[PDB]
A and B are shown apart, each in its own frame.
Chain A
Amino acid sequence: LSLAPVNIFKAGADEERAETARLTSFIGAIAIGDLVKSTLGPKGMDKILLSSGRDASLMVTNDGATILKNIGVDNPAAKVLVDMSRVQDDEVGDGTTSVTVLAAELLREAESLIAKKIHPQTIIAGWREATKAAREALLSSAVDHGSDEVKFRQDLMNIAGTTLSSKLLTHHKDHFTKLAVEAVLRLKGSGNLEAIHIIKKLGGSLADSYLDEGFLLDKKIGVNQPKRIENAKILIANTGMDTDKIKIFGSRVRVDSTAKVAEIEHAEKEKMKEKVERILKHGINCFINRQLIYNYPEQLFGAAGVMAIEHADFAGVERLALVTGGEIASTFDHPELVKLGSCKLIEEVMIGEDKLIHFSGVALGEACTIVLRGATQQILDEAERSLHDALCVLAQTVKDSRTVYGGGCSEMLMAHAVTQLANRTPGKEAVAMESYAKALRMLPTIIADNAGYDSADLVAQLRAAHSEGNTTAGLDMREGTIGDMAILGITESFQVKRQVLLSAAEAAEVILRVDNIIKAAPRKRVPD
C-alpha cells in the first residue's frame, strides 16, 4: 500500500515519481516568472527587499537579476532559473527579466501538451527545429552599421535611451543618455569597463549628476604641502616607504655598546634620504604612491615643494596611469627609461561636505569618474545599478556593431518564422512548434498589459502586419497605438536578443527532461 514494503532510503530522504515531479518542477518555475513579470517594459513597477537576518538591509531594485539572487528559494527546479539569470547579467548585463519570463512561458505551454498524451521527447525534438528557424530569421533582419560616424553615434544614442526606460532614470532620460554615451567613447575601443569609477554621495537632486572632464580622487595630501600646482609632472610609483625597506633576510644587530646602536639608527635615516633624492632626479612635483608614507619622507617632499598622495589602492593607480599617461615606477635607478604623466591644474574641490583632488586638463583621459547625487540612499544605489546596465550594453555594440529593431518588433518577427514552419512539418511536432510561437508573442503582451492597454487587440494588429510585409512594425508606448520602429527610434543590441533565445531554450530543455526528483537528508543546523 505504501511506497514498496521494504525500506531503501534513510530517514528524512524523499523521492518523487513521474506524475508528481512534473507537478513540482512546473509550479516552481511559473512562480519565479510571475513575481518578475511586473517589472517588464517601459511602465514596469518596482519592488522592496528586506533582509531578516542581515541587520535589516533595505534595498530597492528593479532588475530581474538582483531580485532572484536575494530571494531564498528551496525549490529544486526554481534554482535553475536563478542560476541562468546570473549568467545573463555576467555576460551582457541586460535582458535578465526577459530571459526568465520567456523560459517560464515555455514551461507553462508544455504542461498542457503533456495532458494531451504527448511524449516529452516529442516536444523537445519539435522545439529544436523551432529555435533554429527563429535564429535564422533574426540574423537576416539585423542592420550592420559603423562605416559612418554620424550614423554610428545616432545608433548608440537610441540604444542608451531604450535601456534606461524601465529604470528610475527614465525621468531624466535626456540628461543621462549623454553621460552614458560619452563615457563609453572615452575608452577608445578598450572593453575595460572598470576604468569608469562611479562615485556616489548623498545630497542634491538626481539632476545634479555630471561627468567630470578630468579625474577625481578621494584621498588627502600631506601636511603643509602645496594645495595647487599648475602644469604638474606626475610620477606614479609603487614602492615601500613604510618605516624603511626591511631588506628581507634573517639579519640582526649584535653590537656591544649603546653608541654603536645610535650609529646604526642614523644609518637608516640616511638610507631614506638617498631614496628620496633619487626620486627628485626625475624633475617632478607630484609624487603618487600606493602605500603609506611616514612622517620622515613626508617632510622631505614638503621642503622641496612636492605633492605626495599616500594610500591609493590598485583601483586608483591603474586608473591614473590611463588618464595622465605615466607609468607605475619602482627601483628608481634610470630616470631616462621612465615616462612621466602630465596635467594642467590640480586643485581641491568641495562636493557636499568632502574634499577631493581634482585633475583639470589631461593628456589622454582614457578613464573618468561620474558623480551621482540623490535624495535617499536607495536612489543612489539604484542609479548606480541602472547606469551599469547602460555601460555594459554599449561596450558590446562597439565590438559587434549590428542592431535589431526592438519594442516588440523582434519578438513578432521570429514568431512568424516558426508559424510558417509549423504549417509544413507533418506529425505531432506541428503542435509542439505552435507552442514555441505562442510563447514568443506573450512578451509584447506583458508590455502592453502593464500600461493598461487593450493587449488582445494590439497583438492581433501586430501579427496581421508582420505576415503581409511590414517588418518594422512595433508597439508605440507613448500613445498606445501601433507605430514604426525605424522612425521613433526603438533599437536594441543583436547580441542581447540572441542570448535570450539560446538561454531560454536550454533551461526549458533541461527542466523538461526531468522525471524523478531525489532528495537527500538535509544537513541539520545546531540550535545550541
Chain B
Amino acid sequence: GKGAYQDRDKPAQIRFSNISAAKAVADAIRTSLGPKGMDKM
C-alpha cells in the first residue's frame, strides 16, 4: 500500500515554524536559572 498522498506543504512548514519560535524563547532565559544564574536588565 502506498496511498494517502499529501499535496499540501503549508501545515508542515507552519508546524516547523512554531517549534523554532518556542525553542528560541526557551534558549533566551536558559541562563537565568538556578542558584548561579545571572540577571537581565
Contact = CB atoms under 8 A, between A and B. Distances in A.
Interface of A: 45, 452-454
B4 A452 contact: yes
A194 B34 CA distance: 49
A454 B4 contact: yes
B3 interface: yes
A351 to B, nearest CB: 30
Nearest to B14: A48
Nearest to B18: A48
B11 interface: yes
Main secondary structure of the interface of A (DSSP, over half): loop
Interface residues of B, number: 3
A454 B5 CA distance: 10
B3 A454 contact: yes
Contacts of A453: 4
B2 to A, nearest CB: 11
A45 B14 CA distance: 12
5 contacts: A45-B11, A452-B4, A453-B4, A454-B3, A454-B4
A458 to B, nearest CB: 12
Contacts of A452: 4
A341 B1 CA distance: 70
Contacts of B4: 452-454
Contacts of B11: 45
B19 to A, nearest CB: 15
B11 to A, nearest CB: 7
A45 B8 CA distance: 14
A322 B22 CA distance: 48
A459 to B, nearest CB: 14
B7 to A, nearest CB: 11
Contacts of B3: 454
A214 B3 CA distance: 55
A60 to B, nearest CB: 12
B1 to A, nearest CB: 9
Q: Which 5 A-B pairs have the closest CB atoms?
A: A452-B4, A454-B3, A45-B11, A454-B4, A453-B4
Interface string B1-41: 00110000001000000000000000000000000000000
A452 B7 CA distance: 12
Nearest to A38: B11
Contacts of A45: 11
A453 B3 CA distance: 9
Nearest to B8: A38
A242 B3 CA distance: 74
Contacts of A454: 3-4
A453 B4 CA distance: 7
Nearest to A456: B3
A452 B11 CA distance: 14
Nearest to A454: B3
A45 B15 CA distance: 12
Nearest to A451: B4
A403 to B, nearest CB: 33
Nearest to A457: B3
A464 to B, nearest CB: 20
Nearest to B6: A452
Nearest to B10: A38
A454 B4 CA distance: 7
A31 to B, nearest CB: 14
A248 to B, nearest CB: 59
A45 B11 CA distance: 10
A170 B3 CA distance: 28
B22 to A, nearest CB: 13
A45 B4 CA distance: 17
A413 to B, nearest CB: 27
Nearest to B11: A45
Nearest to B1: A454
A20 B10 CA distance: 30
Nearest to A453: B4
B5 to A, nearest CB: 10
A454 B2 CA distance: 11
B10 to A, nearest CB: 9
A480 to B, nearest CB: 11
A404 to B, nearest CB: 31
